[PDB]
Amino acid sequence: SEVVIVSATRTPIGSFLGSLSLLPATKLGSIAIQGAIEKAGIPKEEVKEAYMGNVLQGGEGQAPTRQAVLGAGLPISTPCTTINKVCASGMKAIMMASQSLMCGHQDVMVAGGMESMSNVPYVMNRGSTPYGGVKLEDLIVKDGLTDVYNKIHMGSCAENTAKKLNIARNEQDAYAINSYTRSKAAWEAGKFGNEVIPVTVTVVVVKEDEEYKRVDFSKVPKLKTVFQKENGTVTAANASTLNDGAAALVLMTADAAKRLNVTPLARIVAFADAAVEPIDFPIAPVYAASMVLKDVGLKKEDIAMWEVNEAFSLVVLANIKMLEIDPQKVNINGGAVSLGHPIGMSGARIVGHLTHALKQGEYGLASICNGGGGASAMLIQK
Amino acid sequence: SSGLVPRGSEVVIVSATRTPIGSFLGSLSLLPATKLGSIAIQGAIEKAGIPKEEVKEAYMGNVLQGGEGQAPTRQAVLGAGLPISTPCTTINKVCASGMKAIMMASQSLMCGHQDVMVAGGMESMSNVPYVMNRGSTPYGGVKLEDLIVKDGLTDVYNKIHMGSCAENTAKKLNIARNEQDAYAINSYTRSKAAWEAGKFGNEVIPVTVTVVKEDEEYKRVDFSKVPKLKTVFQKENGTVTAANASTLNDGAAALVLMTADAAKRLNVTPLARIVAFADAAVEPIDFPIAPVYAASMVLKDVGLKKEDIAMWEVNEAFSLVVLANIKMLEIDPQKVNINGGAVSLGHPIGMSGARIVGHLTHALKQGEYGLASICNGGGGASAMLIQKL
Amino acid sequence: SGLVPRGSEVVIVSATRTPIGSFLGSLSLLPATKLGSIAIQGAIEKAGIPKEEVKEAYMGNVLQGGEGQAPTRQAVLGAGLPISTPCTTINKVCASGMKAIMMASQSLMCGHQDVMVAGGMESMSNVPYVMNRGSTPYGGVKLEDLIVKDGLTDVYNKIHMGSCAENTAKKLNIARNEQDAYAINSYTRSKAAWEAGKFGNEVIPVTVVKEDEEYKRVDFSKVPKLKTVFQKENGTVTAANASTLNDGAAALVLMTADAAKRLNVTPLARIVAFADAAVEPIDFPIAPVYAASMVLKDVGLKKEDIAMWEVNEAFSLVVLANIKMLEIDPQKVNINGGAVSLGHPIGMSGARIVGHLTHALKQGEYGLASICNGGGGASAMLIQKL
Amino acid sequence: PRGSEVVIVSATRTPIGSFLGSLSLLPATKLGSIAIQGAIEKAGIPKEEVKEAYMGNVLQGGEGQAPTRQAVLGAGLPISTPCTTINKVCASGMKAIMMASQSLMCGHQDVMVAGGMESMSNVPYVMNRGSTPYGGVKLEDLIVKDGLTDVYNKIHMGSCAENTAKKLNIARNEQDAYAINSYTRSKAAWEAGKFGNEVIPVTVTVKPDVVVKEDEEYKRVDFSKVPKLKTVFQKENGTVTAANASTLNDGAAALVLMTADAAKRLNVTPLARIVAFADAAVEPIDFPIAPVYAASMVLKDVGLKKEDIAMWEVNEAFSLVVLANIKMLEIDPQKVNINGGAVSLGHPIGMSGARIVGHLTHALKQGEYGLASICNGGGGASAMLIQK
Ligand SMILES: CC(C)(COP(=O)(O)OP(=O)(O)OC[C@H]1O[C@@H](n2cnc3c(N)ncnc32)[C@H](O)[C@@H]1OP(=O)(O)O)[C@@H](O)C(=O)NCCC(=O)NCCS
Ligand SMILES: CC(C)(COP(=O)(O)OP(=O)(O)OC[C@H]1O[C@@H](n2cnc3c(N)ncnc32)[C@H](O)[C@@H]1OP(=O)(O)O)[C@@H](O)C(=O)NCCC(=O)NCCS
Ligand SMILES: CC(C)(COP(=O)(O)OP(=O)(O)OC[C@H]1O[C@@H](n2cnc3c(N)ncnc32)[C@H](O)[C@@H]1OP(=O)(O)O)[C@@H](O)C(=O)NCCC(=O)NCCS
Ligand SMILES: CC(C)(COP(=O)(O)OP(=O)(O)OC[C@H]1O[C@@H](n2cnc3c(N)ncnc32)[C@H](O)[C@@H]1OP(=O)(O)O)[C@@H](O)C(=O)NCCC(=O)NCCS
Ligand SMILES: [Cl-]
Ligand SMILES: [Cl-]
Ligand SMILES: [Cl-]
């Protein structure tokens, strides 16, 4: 049977070395899982399998998704799998659980994503120490943010796209400022009340994303470009930040929803993956969103809300340009530039956000790129 | 049956290929897991006799991804010369990882979302790094943890080694040091026999290392030493040794999976049909019993009985895991791991679940049912039933 | 456990029918095939699709003699459907209208067709008499009534369908009393539905006939006075409490879920499951009990999960036997009347009752239609509204 | 074959009797009991394994209630067997096989009997219900009215045949060269034992039994009279005669069908797999060329080409029909109706479609592809592709 999102919940997003930095990604995962099952109004026993996206798994201990599940009090008998599709991971987890549900292999799943960038370690190779020194690599840079083929940062890939599509620093800064503004408005206006579950840190109660407050509008046009010396557009204010957080969605068949007498928030309509040249990852979401629209036969103007994950302001701007969509329909309550971006979580966060912000009958399209030249996109309706 | 809509056509396996399994810091140690990945994948596409442009999506198991670089499955794919258009996803269900990637690729084909994929598994234990926490260096020093021990082999909840959980199951089920040792030299024998016999000529593809045609581990044996080795995970009254536990290894395995329409459209004849599969989970410490339940589940549905299976591949994470499965299932030990397995062939941990499925593919004669099962740390297991031709 | 999932269900997009005319009554001038044309044309209309999207037609039709060549082809071409649409006439005696929907469904499930019309037709007014070919025997020649010979006589017991019913009344102790009360309940339920306008959805006026003729032909005072026509002495079955001989056609547009999407059409109902059962020829009245049981068993549904039962009223006796053995709520059975009051054009009835559930069920409700047939068979269909 | 793929496990028939001839004393339902009972014996399965039966039967008037149920119960099959009688006029016996194959494919049954039966000898005359009109009434012949008259054009099938002769230009002579080509092919086949697995003799019992063992019709020729006969469906300019048209006949045919899985469970070796099938329809008057479209449909469906077909059975409703088919398909005439057809063997309407499939089943060599097609009244055709 058809896939329904029964609930969608997430921790706040904390800053790098910030308010959630004491919590492992797996704990953040448990908090969001518990909060999700709670909001669904179903027995914890009902959840049969779990997929969690988690990009930087080194040092987290054996089977991270199993840790998240068992630390949320879900049954011992729940199978668990950790998904890695770089920034798309959180979305890919929901896609893969939707497939399992559709197949009939499960009736009720949890799916989402978790990341604690604050706790990602450094690595030293196993082997004989080279004469003249030993390297100690940062796993965030090495596995998170470095393109393998070009050997440049993701920010430098963004720059390649900014040049190719003539998106200037001016338009990127305006967008970054716009995300902060939309993020502040949305929080003041309690738009995240239903989405976010507060986290009490026991050494301290965190109930709000901390990143959007870390802004000074006048500094923005003054910042040096980080990924490129001259003719650079991408800066620390206009690029997403490194963050900690977790998201969880309770998914089930329409039939399981009827059986358990629960009222689905949204139905999953369609989803797709696309891949392009590794360097071109910013536009991969264009092709993934297009595949979803073609497949179900809708056109751009039929969707009420777009969530093009804000990896860089440049990315959203590239998508709006190529898809010729109404920029006032995109990332309307902020996004990763001002909310932050715990890599394995963001794909799930953006689906969870559509689930809550869309009005009855409306179509929401979530898209997200990933290191390697990839993207996922998902179409939901309420 | 009463007017229910028929089930669609099944997913087929049209090629199974792998690298040989290298020893820890042995023959294949200079190769990253994603390179071994690209070799096994390239090899599967070649054996399928299809254009590489036909593979639509790839899933690889890979448990210890630390230091491998961004998107390890995508590295393996683009390194195998597949198109920049191929979506890629790396999967971690700790030892069940390689099997779970085939289960999940299967589900995608059954939904009609793809018509052809590669699914497999890859591990280079030789190249798994050590880690240091981010933050301030504590006064008095720090111990850089080994990721094999810390993310691979340590149970989180009980704070003990996989080998020590196996010990807790040996005690419960009366599985003595003696049986474990016999099963072990048994495995080493079968591996030897099977390589002599030419059994691995279709699956194993050779690797050329520049600055290996055969598995290396099965030749790493001393039958006289076995009964007088120290019990390495338990002090006194132990049963598990370095000889009857599996080793740390490097290796990749990949399979081409297809719908029956894609098999028709490219006029390839499948090697095997995937029948059923299931995941089970129990108490973390009891991971060695979990594979019995997954395999029960796969037999319950489809309505077969254990005597219907020609070949069992129960991963030898420990000789005791295999033995404890045999005990509870009451199956014919002469039908289990008949060309050997992990204890003697090696256990490159993300690769194994894919290796055993791919081996059943090559070994079952026409009409035969093969059951593959595999435990994973955490309390889990994955099980798959295939049928030859 | 990793079993390949089941395909998409077959959906019912429209379901229409002519009024049911009385024997030699108001539709008696029209051949069964003309009735089929009318039902089919209206079904296509109600569905909202081009005629040319219909790929194939199966129509039940029991008494084919005299209708001319390929009756279903006649109905189909008489409705203006393409000359390229293949036509087959089905005969499973009183199950034929339902067996035609079942078979069309199987074709849909196989991917052999994407859109079909299925239903049934009968003009019992125009059923001929027959005379054997060969030599006239000395002393007189018999002209047999095909209604009697091919329609209503059990081959094996050489008795009327009505006498088989008597066998069950006896076996299960269903008295003339229960049967007459049931028949009167069908007449009142019929009239009530017609006046409510409960058939405004399914019935296509024939143009002059707008409404089922049979439900008005009743006299309540005469009911306990009637003769037991199938067994003199101790009988229970009478003309009031047995179904009547009638004229009518019913048609449904069946589609795959893809074809409904492609055609931008919203399905009335899903076909969930269906089966045929058979018992000893004389025992046909209980056969629907077994067919419906197998349908419920297969979908792991329980008898209480069913909102509305349509158990064809061949005889008041059949419905009562089914109610007794299924142990189901009489108030959920044949709620808007049935064949005793509405009439029974034998090839049409199994289609009509499916069509009726599709309009009468409320969203998400399950309905179960069952119908006995001559020779000891029965068919049953489970559908779900929306 | 494997799983739900459909296989033919046996195929048998009665002899075909002549109109008012060898088998004329048996009702079509009895012929059907004989063929069903025979096909099950040859299947080598218990009769309780057959779960459902479909029988083609075109002229059902006066046969009594539920003719397929009569055929089934008369073969001694259990009373739990559902039965349905199928009418697609001369495609009926093939459509029964196609419909049974869909049930099997769907998983709703695992083992079925499908075939067809017809006793044209016993088809009655009909009299309208109601008031007898002053001045009398012609009692119509059901064979003519329901079997052989096109509703729309209001003419005999034979006259629809003359339409396609004048059009494809099929002269009389090509036509009854074909008819003697058929009588010859049948005689050889019979003499050479070629129907020995396929046909099972009928013991007609009365009140001193008589055993009918051979198709009765193929002896009734005279290669010398053929070019001399009156064109019976058209005075001026005709081409179809009694010699070059099929005759009216009695016979029945049954096939045991099952899934490849059921064959494996029951430990029996199937004869052929049903690869694919189709129906097509054109203008009623043009029925003789409908099998052209139905045959191409199955070939197209399956990616096979006309030359990969080892044997064709194009039912011989008229010599005209096979020639039009040979013509439009551009097919080798030596691969068509190789052992004779309905012109010389006879044509029990509801049976012929099952006969031609049953025939391919026996005559094909291993791995070979057979294609059966058959036209029907109202402008339809059915076609089935089989592999041995
Ligand atoms: C860009 C990045 C390198 C930040 O590093 P950094 O330059 O050291 O960050 P800083 O906080 O020091 O930023 C530099 C300056 O910008 C300022 N700043 C950052 N965001 C600002 C904002 N929103 N408004 C005003 N000032 C801001 C800082 O105050 C700092 O100013 P200072 O020099 O006077 O102190 C890092 O966040 C990154 O790698 N982001 C990309 C994440 C990514 O690629 N995600 C994956 C998606 S594919
Ligand atoms: C067992 C393990 C801890 C290795 O530790 P180790 O004892 O230091 O390994 P060694 O090779 O040094 O073994 C010690 C002795 O056993 C001997 N041994 C190893 N293989 C042998 C063979 N097959 N025949 C006879 N003796 C053998 C060695 O020769 C050595 O002898 P020595 O001490 O006299 O020189 C390690 O391989 C491990 O953690 N395995 C488990 C992996 C696992 O659980 N996989 C995941 C599934 S849950
Ligand atoms: C029952 C059947 C034999 C008709 O019987 P009939 O006696 O020939 O028909 P009649 O109309 O003359 O009915 C006899 C009497 O019943 C009366 N009547 C019939 N139905 C009545 C009712 N609904 N209420 C009051 N009176 C009724 C008539 O007025 C007539 O009365 P009268 O002659 O004493 O004045 C015939 O319709 C039949 O065989 N139906 C059964 C259908 C069947 O077998 N089912 C399908 C196969 S399972
Ligand atoms: C044609 C039909 C009406 C037969 O009627 P008929 O012509 O009076 O039958 P007959 O037996 O008298 O045949 C006429 C002559 O042909 C002769 N004959 C029959 N077959 C012959 C042959 N193969 N070779 C030589 N002579 C033959 C007869 O001896 C007879 O000659 P006669 O008058 O000198 O004695 C009848 O068979 C029919 O309607 N067939 C049509 C089949 C059909 O349409 N089937 C449905 C498919 S769409
Ligand atoms: Cl698990
Ligand atoms: Cl029946
Ligand atoms: Cl037709």
mmCIF file of N, CA and C in Angstrom, chain A residues 49 51 57 59 61-62 66-67 76-77 80-82 84 92 96 99 105 118 120-124 126 136 138 143-144 149 154 273 275-277 371-372, chain B residues 57 59 65 67 69-70 74-75 84-85 89-93 100 104 107 113 126 128-132 134 146 150-152 157 162 279 281-283 378:
data_model
loop_
_atom_site.group_PDB
_atom_site.id
_atom_site.type_symbol
_atom_site.label_atom_id
_atom_site.label_comp_id
_atom_site.label_asym_id
_atom_site.label_seq_id
_atom_site.Cartn_x
_atom_site.Cartn_y
_atom_site.Cartn_z
ATOM 1 N N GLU A 49 11.118 -1.533 11.475
ATOM 2 C CA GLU A 49 12.471 -1.382 10.936
ATOM 3 C C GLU A 49 12.856 0.100 10.984
ATOM 4 N N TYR A 51 15.710 3.122 9.215
ATOM 5 C CA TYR A 51 16.827 3.584 8.377
ATOM 6 C C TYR A 51 17.185 4.986 8.819
ATOM 7 N N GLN A 57 30.461 8.548 10.166
ATOM 8 C CA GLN A 57 30.138 7.501 11.160
ATOM 9 C C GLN A 57 31.328 7.130 12.049
ATOM 10 N N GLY A 59 34.047 6.707 14.676
ATOM 11 C CA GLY A 59 34.048 6.903 16.127
ATOM 12 C C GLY A 59 32.721 6.867 16.863
ATOM 13 N N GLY A 61 30.803 4.394 17.247
ATOM 14 C CA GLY A 61 30.537 3.070 17.743
ATOM 15 C C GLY A 61 29.754 2.230 16.749
ATOM 16 N N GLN A 62 29.657 0.955 17.076
ATOM 17 C CA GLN A 62 29.113 -0.047 16.159
ATOM 18 C C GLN A 62 27.641 0.194 15.822
ATOM 19 N N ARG A 66 21.224 1.404 14.993
ATOM 20 C CA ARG A 66 20.789 0.511 16.074
ATOM 21 C C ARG A 66 20.907 1.229 17.434
ATOM 22 N N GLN A 67 22.027 1.915 17.673
ATOM 23 C CA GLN A 67 22.158 2.752 18.895
ATOM 24 C C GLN A 67 21.079 3.785 19.088
ATOM 25 N N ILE A 76 13.982 -4.402 20.658
ATOM 26 C CA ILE A 76 15.116 -5.287 20.360
ATOM 27 C C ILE A 76 15.044 -5.967 19.009
ATOM 28 N N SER A 77 13.818 -6.224 18.555
ATOM 29 C CA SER A 77 13.590 -6.991 17.352
ATOM 30 C C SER A 77 13.573 -6.097 16.107
ATOM 31 N N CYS A 80 17.977 -2.498 11.715
ATOM 32 C CA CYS A 80 18.460 -1.125 11.644
ATOM 33 C C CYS A 80 19.547 -1.086 10.603
ATOM 34 N N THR A 81 19.552 -0.041 9.777
ATOM 35 C CA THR A 81 20.570 0.102 8.707
ATOM 36 C C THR A 81 20.930 1.579 8.631
ATOM 37 N N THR A 82 22.211 1.883 8.478
ATOM 38 C CA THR A 82 22.699 3.258 8.407
ATOM 39 C C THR A 82 23.041 3.586 6.976
ATOM 40 N N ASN A 84 24.352 6.061 3.873
ATOM 41 C CA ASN A 84 25.223 7.157 3.531
ATOM 42 C C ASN A 84 25.113 7.474 2.033
ATOM 43 N N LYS A 92 17.478 9.899 1.339
ATOM 44 C CA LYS A 92 17.617 8.536 0.817
ATOM 45 C C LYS A 92 17.070 7.526 1.826
ATOM 46 N N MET A 96 14.309 4.810 0.663
ATOM 47 C CA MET A 96 14.472 3.363 0.864
ATOM 48 C C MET A 96 13.457 2.628 1.791
ATOM 49 N N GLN A 99 10.247 2.446 -0.172
ATOM 50 C CA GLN A 99 10.313 1.291 -1.068
ATOM 51 C C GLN A 99 9.995 -0.010 -0.342
ATOM 52 N N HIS A 105 7.137 -5.434 2.549
ATOM 53 C CA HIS A 105 8.061 -6.136 3.452
ATOM 54 C C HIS A 105 7.985 -5.649 4.895
ATOM 55 N N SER A 118 30.185 18.305 15.536
ATOM 56 C CA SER A 118 31.024 18.695 16.658
ATOM 57 C C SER A 118 31.877 17.503 17.098
ATOM 58 N N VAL A 120 32.736 14.699 15.184
ATOM 59 C CA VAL A 120 33.492 13.947 14.187
ATOM 60 C C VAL A 120 34.991 14.045 14.552
ATOM 61 N N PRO A 121 35.742 12.915 14.548
ATOM 62 C CA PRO A 121 37.191 12.900 14.922
ATOM 63 C C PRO A 121 38.196 13.182 13.810
ATOM 64 N N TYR A 122 39.478 13.219 14.186
ATOM 65 C CA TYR A 122 40.573 13.195 13.269
ATOM 66 C C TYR A 122 41.008 11.745 13.093
ATOM 67 N N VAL A 123 41.613 11.419 11.952
ATOM 68 C CA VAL A 123 42.100 10.066 11.655
ATOM 69 C C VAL A 123 43.593 10.064 11.411
ATOM 70 N N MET A 124 44.235 8.980 11.813
ATOM 71 C CA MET A 124 45.620 8.726 11.472
ATOM 72 C C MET A 124 45.644 7.365 10.798
ATOM 73 N N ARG A 126 46.633 3.670 9.569
ATOM 74 C CA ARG A 126 47.229 2.500 10.175
ATOM 75 C C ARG A 126 48.441 2.235 9.350
ATOM 76 N N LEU A 136 47.439 14.120 10.207
ATOM 77 C CA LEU A 136 46.281 13.860 10.982
ATOM 78 C C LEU A 136 45.118 14.610 10.331
ATOM 79 N N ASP A 138 41.204 15.679 9.160
ATOM 80 C CA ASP A 138 39.958 16.033 9.784
ATOM 81 C C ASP A 138 38.860 15.287 8.990
ATOM 82 N N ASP A 143 36.149 13.294 4.587
ATOM 83 C CA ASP A 143 35.074 12.460 4.110
ATOM 84 C C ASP A 143 33.838 13.341 3.849
ATOM 85 N N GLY A 144 33.730 14.494 4.498
ATOM 86 C CA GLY A 144 32.495 15.267 4.397
ATOM 87 C C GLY A 144 32.518 16.180 3.173
ATOM 88 N N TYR A 149 37.433 13.574 -6.869
ATOM 89 C CA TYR A 149 37.963 13.511 -8.229
ATOM 90 C C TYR A 149 38.742 14.787 -8.583
ATOM 91 N N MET A 154 33.828 21.337 -1.619
ATOM 92 C CA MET A 154 32.473 21.582 -2.137
ATOM 93 C C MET A 154 32.174 23.049 -2.428
ATOM 94 N N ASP A 273 16.451 9.981 -7.742
ATOM 95 C CA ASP A 273 17.873 10.336 -7.611
ATOM 96 C C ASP A 273 18.390 10.723 -8.978
ATOM 97 N N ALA A 275 22.322 11.967 -10.993
ATOM 98 C CA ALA A 275 23.732 12.209 -10.794
ATOM 99 C C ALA A 275 24.332 12.840 -12.049
ATOM 100 N N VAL A 276 25.224 13.812 -11.850
ATOM 101 C CA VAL A 276 25.915 14.544 -12.926
ATOM 102 C C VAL A 276 27.427 14.489 -12.664
ATOM 103 N N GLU A 277 28.243 15.276 -13.391
ATOM 104 C CA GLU A 277 29.684 15.387 -13.120
ATOM 105 C C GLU A 277 29.901 15.785 -11.660
ATOM 106 N N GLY A 371 27.627 15.444 -2.370
ATOM 107 C CA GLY A 371 29.015 15.227 -2.821
ATOM 108 C C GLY A 371 29.127 14.028 -3.750
ATOM 109 N N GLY A 372 29.884 14.159 -4.836
ATOM 110 C CA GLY A 372 29.971 13.063 -5.820
ATOM 111 C C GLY A 372 29.249 13.369 -7.140
ATOM 112 N N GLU B 57 21.746 2.065 -11.038
ATOM 113 C CA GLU B 57 21.895 2.464 -9.617
ATOM 114 C C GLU B 57 22.775 1.446 -8.862
ATOM 115 N N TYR B 59 24.358 -0.023 -4.972
ATOM 116 C CA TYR B 59 24.360 -0.026 -3.523
ATOM 117 C C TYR B 59 25.521 -0.900 -3.075
ATOM 118 N N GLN B 65 33.985 3.160 7.044
ATOM 119 C CA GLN B 65 34.069 4.113 5.931
ATOM 120 C C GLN B 65 35.072 5.230 6.232
ATOM 121 N N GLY B 67 37.970 7.619 6.650
ATOM 122 C CA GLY B 67 39.140 7.939 5.866
ATOM 123 C C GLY B 67 39.076 7.475 4.431
ATOM 124 N N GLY B 69 37.142 8.664 2.153
ATOM 125 C CA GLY B 69 36.856 9.782 1.259
ATOM 126 C C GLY B 69 35.353 9.841 1.001
ATOM 127 N N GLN B 70 34.931 10.946 0.390
ATOM 128 C CA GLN B 70 33.507 11.230 0.165
ATOM 129 C C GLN B 70 32.845 10.119 -0.648
ATOM 130 N N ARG B 74 30.017 5.726 -4.669
ATOM 131 C CA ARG B 74 30.286 6.514 -5.867
ATOM 132 C C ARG B 74 31.758 6.406 -6.365
ATOM 133 N N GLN B 75 32.728 6.340 -5.444
ATOM 134 C CA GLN B 75 34.151 6.131 -5.869
ATOM 135 C C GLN B 75 34.346 4.814 -6.626
ATOM 136 N N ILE B 84 28.706 8.868 -15.132
ATOM 137 C CA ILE B 84 28.465 9.943 -14.148
ATOM 138 C C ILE B 84 26.997 10.048 -13.765
ATOM 139 N N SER B 85 26.116 9.377 -14.513
ATOM 140 C CA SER B 85 24.676 9.453 -14.225
ATOM 141 C C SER B 85 24.167 8.408 -13.198
ATOM 142 N N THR B 89 24.785 4.693 -3.294
ATOM 143 C CA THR B 89 24.412 4.755 -1.894
ATOM 144 C C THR B 89 25.241 3.674 -1.170
ATOM 145 N N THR B 90 25.864 4.060 -0.047
ATOM 146 C CA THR B 90 26.658 3.153 0.781
ATOM 147 C C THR B 90 25.847 2.767 1.973
ATOM 148 N N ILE B 91 25.898 1.504 2.325
ATOM 149 C CA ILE B 91 25.002 0.962 3.301
ATOM 150 C C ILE B 91 25.803 0.307 4.429
ATOM 151 N N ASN B 92 25.319 0.496 5.645
ATOM 152 C CA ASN B 92 25.945 -0.078 6.812
ATOM 153 C C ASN B 92 24.950 -0.746 7.736
ATOM 154 N N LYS B 93 24.988 -2.076 7.731
ATOM 155 C CA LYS B 93 24.237 -2.877 8.698
ATOM 156 C C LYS B 93 25.252 -3.789 9.347
ATOM 157 N N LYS B 100 22.340 -7.015 2.906
ATOM 158 C CA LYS B 100 21.385 -5.915 2.937
ATOM 159 C C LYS B 100 21.434 -5.027 1.683
ATOM 160 N N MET B 104 18.059 -4.492 -0.531
ATOM 161 C CA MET B 104 17.559 -3.147 -0.801
ATOM 162 C C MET B 104 17.549 -2.818 -2.292
ATOM 163 N N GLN B 107 14.455 -4.563 -3.536
ATOM 164 C CA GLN B 107 13.254 -3.746 -3.310
ATOM 165 C C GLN B 107 13.048 -2.629 -4.285
ATOM 166 N N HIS B 113 11.351 0.977 -9.828
ATOM 167 C CA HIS B 113 12.092 2.241 -9.815
ATOM 168 C C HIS B 113 13.372 2.152 -10.598
ATOM 169 N N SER B 126 42.747 -3.592 6.428
ATOM 170 C CA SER B 126 44.139 -3.160 6.444
ATOM 171 C C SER B 126 44.243 -1.653 6.473
ATOM 172 N N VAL B 128 41.741 0.651 7.553
ATOM 173 C CA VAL B 128 40.857 1.338 8.519
ATOM 174 C C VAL B 128 41.749 2.164 9.453
ATOM 175 N N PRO B 129 41.429 3.452 9.650
ATOM 176 C CA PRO B 129 42.336 4.292 10.475
ATOM 177 C C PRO B 129 42.130 4.164 12.003
ATOM 178 N N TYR B 130 42.940 4.916 12.744
ATOM 179 C CA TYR B 130 42.775 5.180 14.176
ATOM 180 C C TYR B 130 42.146 6.553 14.299
ATOM 181 N N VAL B 131 41.438 6.817 15.380
ATOM 182 C CA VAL B 131 40.847 8.141 15.567
ATOM 183 C C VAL B 131 41.301 8.888 16.815
ATOM 184 N N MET B 132 41.292 10.221 16.736
ATOM 185 C CA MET B 132 41.512 11.089 17.896
ATOM 186 C C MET B 132 40.369 12.045 18.024
ATOM 187 N N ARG B 134 38.228 15.331 18.548
ATOM 188 C CA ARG B 134 38.323 16.725 18.289
ATOM 189 C C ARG B 134 38.185 17.389 19.680
ATOM 190 N N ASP B 146 41.339 2.467 17.873
ATOM 191 C CA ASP B 146 41.412 1.733 16.624
ATOM 192 C C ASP B 146 39.963 1.525 16.115
ATOM 193 N N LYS B 150 36.832 -0.200 17.667
ATOM 194 C CA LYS B 150 35.821 0.700 18.205
ATOM 195 C C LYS B 150 34.491 0.740 17.436
ATOM 196 N N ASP B 151 34.536 0.707 16.103
ATOM 197 C CA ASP B 151 33.298 0.722 15.332
ATOM 198 C C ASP B 151 32.954 -0.669 14.744
ATOM 199 N N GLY B 152 33.964 -1.491 14.480
ATOM 200 C CA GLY B 152 33.781 -2.832 13.916
ATOM 201 C C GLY B 152 33.382 -3.898 14.949
ATOM 202 N N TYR B 157 26.558 -1.850 24.032
ATOM 203 C CA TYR B 157 25.681 -1.921 25.211
ATOM 204 C C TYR B 157 26.279 -2.730 26.344
ATOM 205 N N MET B 162 32.816 -8.671 20.100
ATOM 206 C CA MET B 162 32.044 -9.728 19.414
ATOM 207 C C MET B 162 32.415 -11.132 19.912
ATOM 208 N N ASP B 279 15.164 -9.743 7.490
ATOM 209 C CA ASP B 279 16.019 -9.308 8.567
ATOM 210 C C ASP B 279 15.337 -9.797 9.831
ATOM 211 N N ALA B 281 16.129 -9.382 14.377
ATOM 212 C CA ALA B 281 16.947 -8.783 15.431
ATOM 213 C C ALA B 281 16.617 -9.349 16.830
ATOM 214 N N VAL B 282 17.659 -9.608 17.643
ATOM 215 C CA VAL B 282 17.545 -10.059 19.066
ATOM 216 C C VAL B 282 18.356 -9.194 20.053
ATOM 217 N N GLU B 283 18.446 -9.609 21.332
ATOM 218 C CA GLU B 283 19.327 -8.917 22.333
ATOM 219 C C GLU B 283 20.775 -8.847 21.803
ATOM 220 N N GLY B 378 25.196 -5.774 17.125
ATOM 221 C CA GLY B 378 23.945 -5.091 17.386
ATOM 222 C C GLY B 378 22.764 -5.991 17.759
#
